[PDB]
Design a protein around this ligand. Structure first.
Ligand SMILES: [Cl-]
Ligand SMILES: [Cl-]
Ligand SMILES: [Cl-]
Ligand SMILES: [Mg+2]
Ligand SMILES: [Mg+2]
Ligand SMILES: [Mg+2]
Ligand SMILES: [Mg+2]
Ligand SMILES: [Mg+2]
Ligand SMILES: [Mg+2]
Ligand SMILES: [Mg+2]
Ligand SMILES: [Mg+2]
Ligand SMILES: [Mg+2]
Ligand SMILES: [Mg+2]
Ligand SMILES: [Mg+2]
Ligand SMILES: [Mg+2]
Ligand SMILES: [Mg+2]
Ligand SMILES: [Mg+2]
Ligand SMILES: [Mg+2]
Ligand SMILES: [Mg+2]
Ligand SMILES: [Mg+2]
Ligand SMILES: [Mg+2]
Ligand SMILES: [Mg+2]
Lengths: 337, 107, 97
RNA sequence: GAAAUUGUUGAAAGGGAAGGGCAUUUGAUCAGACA
RNA sequence: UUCAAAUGAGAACUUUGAAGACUGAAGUGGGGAAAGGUUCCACGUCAACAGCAGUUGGACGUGGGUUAGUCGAUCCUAAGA
RNA sequence: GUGAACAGCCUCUAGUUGAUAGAAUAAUGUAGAUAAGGGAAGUCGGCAAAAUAGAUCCGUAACUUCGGGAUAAGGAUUGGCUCUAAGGGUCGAUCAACUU
RNA sequence: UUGGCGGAAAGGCCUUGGGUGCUUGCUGGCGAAUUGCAAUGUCAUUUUGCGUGGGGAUAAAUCAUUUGUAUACGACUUAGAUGUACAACGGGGUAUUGUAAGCAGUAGAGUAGCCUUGUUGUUACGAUCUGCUGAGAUUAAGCCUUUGUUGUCUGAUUUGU
């Protein structure tokens, strides 16, 4: 997640007062460089639930993924996957043997992918590794697809498209220990209250002689897992395309990055996804975008969205200019130049 | 004696969460370790083999002061002294017999 | 080894949001921490002339920038002195022969 | 130089108390007849 | 409150210098009545006391110090005894 | 010095710099504060808080023991700078005050 | 040893070939005692340790330091042994305020002084105004960026089927 901005578009909604009229909406931008496939995993149905049977890794792994396996990378000998790579040094009978096992027994196939964290302006340098399920085709086709994509990159435009409802999964911003008044939204006690007023006056009756689980108590606020659904994609952005922040109406040559860069994040030099509304999590946090679990047809979806204007003024203050050229034209020459 | 004390990451070496840095008690122990090593050298023991084979702390008689409380009351205000000592050192029935006899001549 | 260099320390960002009664004493400890980072010496000694420069405008009137001369001498310790300049702006690290 | 209470060493047990009664297993320890 | 030096086995707290501050003349200044009784001053010294510390102290040990014809008491009488 | 002022605020002389410290800045507190639109709907009750505030000029009701009520209520003005007028002492001259 | 099958916790089942042992399917020949008239009369499989020799493999974690997407303390998330490395400064961008100091002016309500009484007399005092000047200052402390400058990069502890 990089940050938020504003867009202007026409509303296509018959029967509404603002039909065929411009509306102003907030959007969230997610920086999405291509992910790299580095393995596959097969799952077997069991009376006790799904069980992973075998994992097969790619022959070569970059230092980004290898950093995930270390806590003290700078002191390590970097021996990870050194003996496993020897399985490819032969004809490949060992690798082919495990792939046949996945084809024969597995009923669910997932691929191990990792982000290219070096392409972001972040300082982490350690990539995030995750499993993504493959849908479509038979079990053999899924394994063959995973095998051919080892050490390759998959772009975001091959997964999502325009005007598609997606779900965002992330961890919310943390706030530490919080009192009941803001953690749960209980009423503040009168000003006359002795011993403090940001509390719950009665936490339980005499019987049962215990505090119940359903009573509001002070504790940790934030940093929770959340799954927010039904977010429409407004734009699938291209990293190498100049005029990312341009529309068919604005026609100015400008990228999606606002003047001065995204606050606390930086510049967007990769592909991005523009999502209507707000998304759980703060800036610089890793997020997972997932396709919807059902076919939505409430006419809020299926609507074709065409952006007219994208705000690129500075978010570090009351920004007034979209581009440096606009500032120079309005102000003229300065003593600095 | 660790009730309601803080916890630190430096306790993971000894598999605990609660640990502290009692500087004053450390200095008293250091002085006695120095004295014991000097005594060992005077006797003629090998310093490289010395290990602490005995160390023991006992309660000394308390030293008493007074503290003043609300509504004109007086409570005690006492110290807990210690006694410290340490030592360093250089590092068949007849039926059973018949069965045994039978087995000897059987193999 | 023994070396003398001149530094510019940004005290504005190091005293951001500090209680007014503690800003000048905090600047003393920040300078000692600053000398530890660059010279790697546990012992840091501040000249009384530098102490006057820090407290020039009261307990809460510390300058935004200070020009410091740091000398590492003989196991080793760092000695910090002020440098008399019109302004501390636009100066980078230089080595003093 | 007793008890409450405490340190060290040794042995033993411990899934929201501990202690007790009857019986036996296991470990440790011990008197009595060799007429 | 801060920097440095001196002393010391040991210094956030002792001494000196420098800096930053406060009381702001109905004072955190300069004297007294009552009450206390050597707490005054010098040297030596840190077990206990100064609810942290201590080389410092109204602490501990040993000594020194209060000079009137004119300042008070003394004399007079008050309510009263 | 400011000002009506032994008010509050700052300084000179003189005297102190003494009250366990270091690090961090969660909840809940104690103390000090600010809030869009509404304006007592809160509460036993405007509790608490807010508003008003010096001075000069204008203006001031019922009632009344004629003394009051009264700062009733209700309005206006206030910096800095450069000037002007008036208000004195001693013997035409000469010298010296902040008041409007 | 050959081949096949079994993934629900497969760790098992079936099969090919030869070697070697036994065979009570049938007929023989030797041995047993004394544990004294019974005494479980000791024939199982659990785990671990120390010594033999026959192969096999040559790492990490924690503390300390650092980061703020985290945080009462622990915990969490990052970085650091030669580099699209990290840090401290500097430069640029982005922001906030609203035109710095200094110098100059035939700007400026007016009032004084001098000789030379000057058809802007000069010289002093004078809130303020104008020009240089959308200037100057501040800008990550939880903003972005960097072919510049100067540095930094082997301390401690513990873990084995
Ligand atoms: Cl009492
Ligand atoms: Cl609070
Ligand atoms: Cl932390
Ligand atoms: Mg809410
Ligand atoms: Mg009350
Ligand atoms: Mg913003
Ligand atoms: Mg407890
Ligand atoms: Mg507590
Ligand atoms: Mg008390
Ligand atoms: Mg009392
Ligand atoms: Mg005795
Ligand atoms: Mg006892
Ligand atoms: Mg005051
Ligand atoms: Mg003052
Ligand atoms: Mg004295
Ligand atoms: Mg004490
Ligand atoms: Mg002491
Ligand atoms: Mg309001
Ligand atoms: Mg309002
Ligand atoms: Mg009401
Ligand atoms: Mg009500
Ligand atoms: Mg009130």
């Amino acid at each position: 997640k990089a940050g938020m901005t504003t867009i202007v578009r026409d509303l296509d909604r018959p029967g509404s007062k603002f039909h065929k009229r411009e509306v102003v909406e907030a959007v969230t931008v997610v920086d999405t460089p291509p992910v790299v496939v580095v393995g596959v995993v097969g799952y077997v149905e069991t009376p006790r639930g799904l069980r992973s049977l075998t994992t097969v890794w790619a022959e070569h792994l970059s230092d980004e993924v290898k950093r995930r396996f270390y806590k003290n990378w700078y002191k390590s000998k970097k021996k990870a996957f050194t003996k496993y790579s020897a399985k490819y040094a032969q004809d490949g009978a060992g690798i082919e043997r495990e792939l046949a096992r996945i084809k024969k027994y597995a009923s669910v196939v997932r691929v191990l992918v990792h982000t290219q964290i070096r392409k972001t302006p972040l300082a982490q340098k350690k990539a995030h590794l995750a499993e993504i399920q493959l849908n479509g085709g038979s079990i053999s086709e899924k394994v063959d697809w995973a095998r051919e994509h080892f050490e390759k990159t998959v772009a975001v435009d091959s997964v999502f498209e325009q005007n598609e409802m997606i779900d965002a999964i992330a961890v919310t911003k943390g706030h530490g220990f919080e009192g009941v008044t803001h953690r749960w939204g209980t009423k503040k006690l009168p000003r006359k209250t002795h011993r403090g007023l940001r509390k719950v006056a009665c936490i339980g009756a005499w019987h049962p002689a215990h505090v119940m689980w359903s009573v509001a108590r002070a504790g940790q606020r934030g940093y929770h897992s959340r799954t927010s659904i039904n977010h429409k994609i407004y734009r699938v952005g291209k990293g190498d395309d100049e005029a990312n922040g341009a529309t068919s109406f604005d026609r100015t040559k400008k990228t999606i990055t606002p003047m001065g860069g995204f606050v606390h994040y930086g510049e967007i030099k990769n592909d991005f996804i523009m999502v209507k509304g707000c998304i759980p999590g703060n800036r610089k946090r890793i997020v997972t975008l997932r396709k919807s679990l059902y076919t939505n047809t409430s006419r809020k979806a299926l609507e074709e969205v065409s952006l007219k204007w994208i705000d690129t003024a500075s978010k570090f203050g009351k920004g007034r200019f979209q581009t440096p050229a606009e500032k120079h034209a309005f102000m003229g020459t300065l003593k600095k130049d | 004696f660790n009730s309601s004390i803080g916890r630190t990451a430096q306790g993971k070496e000894f598999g605990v969460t609660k640990a502290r840095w009692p500087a004053k008690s450390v200095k008293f122990v250091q002085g006695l370790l120095q004295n014991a090593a000097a005594n060992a050298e005077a006797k003629g023991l090998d310093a490289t083999k010395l290990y602490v084979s005995h160390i023991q702390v006992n309660q000394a008689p308390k030293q008493r002061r007074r503290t003043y409380r609300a509504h004109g009351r007086i409570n005690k205000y006492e110290s807990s002294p210690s006694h410290i000592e340490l030592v360093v050192t250089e590092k068949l029935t007849s039926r059973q017999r018949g069965r045994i006899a039978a087995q000897k001549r059987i193999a | 080894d023994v070396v003398t260099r001149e530094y510019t320390i940004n005290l504005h960002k190091r005293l951001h949001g500090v209680s007014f009664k503690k800003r000048a004493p905090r600047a003393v400890k920040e300078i000692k921490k600053f000398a530890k980072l660059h010279m790697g010496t546990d012992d840091v000694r501040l000249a009384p002339e530098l102490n006057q420069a820090i407290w020039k405008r009261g307990v809460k009137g510390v300058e935004y920038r200070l020009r410091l001369r740091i000398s590492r001498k003989r196991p080793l310790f760092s000695y910090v002195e002020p440098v008399l300049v019109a302004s501390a702006k636009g100066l980078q690290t230089v080595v003093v022969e």
